[PDB]
RNA sequence: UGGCGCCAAGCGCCCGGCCCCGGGGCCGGGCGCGACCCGCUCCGGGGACAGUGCCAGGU
RNA sequence: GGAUUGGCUCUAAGGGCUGGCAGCCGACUUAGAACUGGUGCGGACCAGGGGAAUCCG
RNA sequence: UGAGCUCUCGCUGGCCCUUGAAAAUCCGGGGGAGAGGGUGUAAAUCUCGCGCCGGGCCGUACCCAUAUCCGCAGCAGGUC
RNA sequence: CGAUGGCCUCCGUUGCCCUCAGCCGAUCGAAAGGGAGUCGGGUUCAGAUCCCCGAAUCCGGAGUGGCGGAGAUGGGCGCCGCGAGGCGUCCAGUGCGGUAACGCGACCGAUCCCGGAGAAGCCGGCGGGAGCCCCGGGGAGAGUUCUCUUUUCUUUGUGAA
């Protein structure tokens, strides 16, 4: 068993000093420092607890070098809102518009009777 | 490193101005052609032998060739 | 009885074309073999014409008032019907379920749909169908 | 009803440039209603008391 | 407040994979029995003395 | 092959009269003001592939402890 | 609006006018918080993720952008041509597929607005993956061999992207 040491000057087990074991071609065990785990974006609905699909889960500054398609899904509000909430929003908009139209026509009928 | 799997695009990258040298590795059961470009090293692996040494004269004349002994 | 007829205006509910308005051109309330679910072939508009107005030249008017259309078969669960309808004629031979087996005549179907949508929109009738849904 | 809403529509009155046959066409601007007018404190709440300065008595 | 505890030789029970069964693999456990030693067996190490009451918090 | 040890990823639950950071930086979306060309040598525009150039300044030896630190010291102390 | 340079083309440089609009307050404050991006092999008396070798990677920049590919090249009509294919008029063309989750190598767009990541406690249980340990063998080299021991010990690998 080969006990192994750190490779940087940070000697504390902080959130940035996270390593993993690897076997080099020289037949030795060494530390490789790992990047922090990214998170997929959360839906803009504010209710759905899951995270969006089709988007890579990497750290924010890694988004600068990804392609456009890897960061979004080809749909209206895609890449920022979930499909279920998009459908609900669509239905809601259409139905409130219809409700307003019928209310206005009823008001016009009442005015005509008056 | 990048692996090239079909025959002709290897020559296509070989004839690029960027390419520096091609080295030929001859192990058992494989023949590897390694072309060194600016960004990547492109490796083309041939399983048989006859394709290898009928391609060995197909490289551009102005491109350095190094046989790994 | 059944209300979703081959002349209805439908708000498309899912897929890449979400929030668009389409017109049903052929409904099938009983699923066929390849599609057990009930469905319908519809023609919609992908790019609504821009908000045209006065005090601009008719070259700009023509450039803005141009439609991009799509033709697609949708499940009924992904289609929201409305109480509106448009009597725009679509050629059955050009626009049919057989259009999807190749990418050659699908372009023809989209061409015909786009042309018909433009010539109907220019008249000003069914103006609600040609304004995007703000959602 | 866990939707959207801005960066004017419209109307009216002027002006410029280009082209065609004083008229028409084409392109591009300005102003005003839309969005009422006039005024002396930004709106409210207190106010000649709160408070402050200096004296006097008590603690 | 009691009893047992070692060594050795066994038995029984507790599973997986493939094609009520058959074959092939298997990981530590638990219980019971016989034999045996100059009664010795948590053999070193580790490892709570106990009970009846009073005062105070 | 293993309820074996360590690390790590994930799922799930419990506790709170405790609910357990901010900003730099980066990204997606809604809108649709603008731009391109009149059928071509197509144009504007490309978060796609390859290619070209550069990355300045400061620290970097060793001890890190019954002898390189602090206790007057090669101090049975202390020191993450 | 005014001037300059570059084949004064088109753009750059300004100077003036019109138009557009918040800041949570200058600035400092972490070698354990946040914070893009380098690994393997070799080398010294004393230095290595720093030197050499070999493989990478991030950010920034570029009049003419250096280049490919995408935007893209279709349809109608009158034709020629036996056809293939080639002419002359019109019309479109800011991509495409999947019912859907979504996918494809890119797939115009400003001021403005919304959202996400950065960005989250302690403890418990379980599962997956590595490293280590363990068992049965093949090698290679060592140890014991008074008797026995197919024996005992060491070693038996592959980076980032
Ligand atoms: Mg740090
Ligand atoms: Mg008493
Ligand atoms: Mg006490
Ligand atoms: Mg050092
Ligand atoms: Mg600072
Ligand atoms: Mg720091
Ligand atoms: Mg590996
Ligand atoms: Zn949601």
Swiss-Prot record, chain A:
Q: Indicate whether Electron transport appears among the record's keywords.
A: no
Which of UniProt's keywords are assigned here? Acetylation, Cytoplasm, Endoplasmic reticulum, Isopeptide bond, Phosphoprotein, Ribonucleoprotein, Ribosomal protein, Ubl conjugation
Top-level taxon = Eukaryota
Q: Name one GO molecular function term.
A: structural constituent of ribosome
- GO biological process, alphabetically ordered: translation
Instruction: Give residue numbers for the modification (N6-acetyllysine).
Output: 35, 42
**Oligomeric and partner information:** Component of the large ribosomal subunit.
Spell out the protein name for this chain: Large ribosomal subunit protein eL34
From Swiss-Prot, chain B:
One GO BP annotation of this record: translation
Supply the Gene3D superfamilies for this chain: 3.30.720.90
What are the N6-acetyllysine sites (modified residues) in this protein?
Answer: 8, 66
Q: What is the first-listed, main subcellular location in coarse terms?
A: cytoplasm
An example molecular function term from Gene Ontology annotations: structural constituent of ribosome
Where does cross-link Glycyl lysine isopeptide (Lys-Gly) (interchain with G-Cter in SUMO2) occur? 3, 8
The UniProt keywords, alphabetically, are:
Acetylation, Cytoplasm, Isopeptide bond, Ribonucleoprotein, Ribosomal protein, Ubl conjugation
Residues in a coiled coil are none
Q: Where in the cell is it found?
A: Cytoplasm
Cellular compartments per GO CC: cytosolic large ribosomal subunit
Family, according to the entry, reads as follows:
Belongs to the eukaryotic ribosomal protein eL38 family.
Q: How does it assemble?
A: Component of the large ribosomal subunit.
PANTHER family (alphabetical): 60S RIBOSOMAL PROTEIN L38, LARGE RIBOSOMAL SUBUNIT PROTEIN EL38
Functional summary from the UniProt entry: Component of the large ribosomal subunit. The ribosome is a large ribonucleoprotein complex responsible for the synthesis of proteins in the cell.
| Protein name as annotated | Large ribosomal subunit protein eL38
- The protein's organism comes out as Oryctolagus cuniculus
From Swiss-Prot, chain C:
Q: What GO biological process, any one, is recorded here?
A: translation
Q: Where is the KOW domain?
A: 6-35
- Family, similarity comment: Belongs to the eukaryotic ribosomal protein eL27 family.
Q: How does it assemble?
A: Component of the large ribosomal subunit. Interacts with RRP1B. Interacts with DHX33.
Q: Which organism is it from?
A: Oryctolagus cuniculus (Rabbit)
Out of the domains of life, which is the source? Eukaryota
Where are residues bearing N6-acetyllysine located in the sequence?
Answer: 26, 92
Would you tell me the protein name for this molecule? Answer: Large ribosomal subunit protein eL27
GO annotations of cellular component type: cytosolic large ribosomal subunit; rough endoplasmic reticulum; synapse
């Amino acid at each position: 068993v080969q006990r192994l040491t750190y490779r940087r000057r940070l000697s504390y087990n902080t959130a940035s000093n996270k390593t993993r074991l690897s076997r080099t071609p020289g037949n030795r065990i060494v530390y490789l420092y790992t990047k922090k785990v990214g998170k997929a974006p959360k839906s803009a609905c504010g209710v759905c607890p899951g995270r969006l699909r089709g988007v890579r889960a990497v750290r924010p500054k890694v988004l600068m070098r990804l392609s456009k398609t890897k960061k979004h899904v080809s749909r209206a509000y895609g890449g920022s809102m979930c499909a279920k909430c998009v459908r609900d929003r669509i239905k809601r908009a259409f139905l409130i518009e219809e409700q307003k139209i019928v209310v206005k026509v009823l008001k016009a009928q009442a005015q005509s009777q008056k | 490193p990048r692996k090239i799997e079909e025959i002709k695009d290897f020559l296509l990258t070989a004839r690029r101005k960027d390419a520096k040298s091609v080295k030929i590795k001859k192990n058992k059961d494989n023949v590897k052609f390694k072309v060194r470009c600016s960004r990547y090293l492109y490796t083309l692996v041939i399983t048989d032998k006859e394709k290898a040494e009928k391609l060995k004269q197909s490289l551009p004349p102005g491109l350095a060739v190094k046989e790994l002994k | 009885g059944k209300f979703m007829k081959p002349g209805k205006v439908v708000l498309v509910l899912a897929g890449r074309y979400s929030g668009r308005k389409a017109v049903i051109v052929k409904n099938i309330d009983d699923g066929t073999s390849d599609r057990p679910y009930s469905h319908a072939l519809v023609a919609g508009i992908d790019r609504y014409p821009r908000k045209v107005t006065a005090a601009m030249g008719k070259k700009k008017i023509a450039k803005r008032s141009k439609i991009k259309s799509f033709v697609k078969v949708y499940n009924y669960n992904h289609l929201m019907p409305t109480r509106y309808s448009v009597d725009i004629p679509l050629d059955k031979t050009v626009v049919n379920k057989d259009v999807f087996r190749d990418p050659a005549l699908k372009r023809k179907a989209r061409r015909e749909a786009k042309v018909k949508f433009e010539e109907r929109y220019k008249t000003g009738k069914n103006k609600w169908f040609f304004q995007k849904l703000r959602f």
